[PDB]
Amino acid sequence: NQYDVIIIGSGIAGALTGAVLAKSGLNVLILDSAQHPRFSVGEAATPESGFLLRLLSKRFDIPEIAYLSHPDKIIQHVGSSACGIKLGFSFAWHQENAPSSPDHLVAPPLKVPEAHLFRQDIDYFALMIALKHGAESRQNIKIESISLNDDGVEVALSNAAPVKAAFIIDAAAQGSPLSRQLGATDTCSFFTHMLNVKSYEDALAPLSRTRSPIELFKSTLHHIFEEGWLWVIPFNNHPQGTNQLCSIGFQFNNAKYRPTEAPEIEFRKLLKKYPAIGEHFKDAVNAREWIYAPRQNVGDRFCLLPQATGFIDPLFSRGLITTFESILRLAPKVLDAARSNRWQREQFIEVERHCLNAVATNDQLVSCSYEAFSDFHLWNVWHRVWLSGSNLGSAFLQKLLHDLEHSGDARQFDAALEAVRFPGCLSLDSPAYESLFRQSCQVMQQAREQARPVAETANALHELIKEHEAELLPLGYSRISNRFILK
Ligand code: EMC
Ligand SMILES: [Ca+2]
Ligand SMILES: [Hg+2]
Ligand SMILES: [Hg+2]
Ligand SMILES: [Hg+2]
Ligand SMILES: [Hg+2]
Ligand SMILES: [Hg+2]
Ligand SMILES: [Hg+2]
Ligand SMILES: [Hg+2]
């Protein structure tokens, strides 16, 4: 074993894993089939993902990692083109064969601003953190074969000698050789970057019409409709930022619409179908090619990170959340394993538990969200389930960050994160919310099998929220006429 850990994928997940382990005294090899700079999706930061980056930073004493959580610090330390601003999520609802209304809009603002991550700069910066702490990085390499045994891992590489390690981590997308070589809602997505995409305010309805507390231009804008959704994620939405691009992607429920032609053709069809969405793109041009994307965890000496186990639908940006929490749970255990020379699956079981629940939680959340797209009033009532969970979890992560900062006790932090009752779930540690979430699923799931009217199901969810309101944070989730829930 020449290295302690081999890492597959040199994107942000693979880079942060590399940095924390290198910092802690492990000899790390990062392996990637591509090279920096390069494009990557997964751009919308969230309150949770912001806290998790600060937890990793504080837990492993790497200040640079925390810069990636604050948009002002990304501008200052990564670069002026590295991000746009996010003051919240927003969801604007549409319908085929009907004019779109500026009243069919929900947008919960954040207390503190988050980033829209321009991943080519953010990821390269993250790799540079890893490189500065002693991680070794090899780019443009082809992994032929991977051999696992009692004493370690051996990875064979095209036109190079094999490389040995005590442990191997898959931090790449699904379908890497480690996934290949070891033994609910159908979707496909299209995405790209564009120049001259108009703002929601200039293109659709100004701020005086929507009465939104935030500009949707300064938000992660999700346009929703019965068969799927389209995202508009600007990088050009803040004075300090020099980036000219908007990230644009759209995704279909293949049970309701199966795309059949090339990406640019499918984009135009969708704009014809929803002319309100089309008002963004009158003078817009593609800045790169459209990507089409159609469609266990651990062992003694390997570990798949969440993104390698399966597709995490980005409707609520839980990819990054689950990715970063996984690294935070796994890293201390990999250190203990390397320091004590014990490499047994049983050591990494809670990383698997978090992962399974996280992706199931996201699957359920997204599956039942695709039904809610059927009608705005139903969507409006449904999103409060997500939001109340997401708010509870964020508060827990903040509480963990605060205790970690005041005490400085790393061992105490790892135990407290391990001891949460519902790891991977939206709330992390609230039994009453998780009850609400499972009952809300059962109302949505039996609403579409046995086809119920959208009014009665919207009412049933509304009654569930009222029943559980006292256990949620005092934000007035039950007030349905209020479409912009303040913190
Ligand atoms: C699978 C919902 Hg914690
Ligand atoms: Ca070593
Ligand atoms: Hg920014
Ligand atoms: Hg498809
Ligand atoms: Hg733009
Ligand atoms: Hg894992
Ligand atoms: Hg998983
Ligand atoms: Hg659900
Ligand atoms: Hg369920």
Automatic annotation (TrEMBL):
Keyword Nucleotide-binding: yes
Pfam families per UniProt: NAD_binding_8
Binding-site residues, FAD 3: 180, 307
Assigned keywords, A-Z: Calcium, FAD, Flavoprotein, Hydrolase, Metal-binding, Nucleotide-binding, Oxidoreductase
Binding site for FAD 1: 12-13, 32, 38, 40-41, 44, 119, 175, 317, 320
EC number(s) stated in the UniProt entry for this protein: 3.8.1.1
GO molecular function: hydrolase activity; metal ion binding; monooxygenase activity; nucleotide binding
Binding sites annotated in the UniProt record for Ca(2+): 4
Binding site for FAD 2: 307
Enzyme class: hydrolase
Record-given protein name: Halogenase PltM
Gene coding for it: pltM
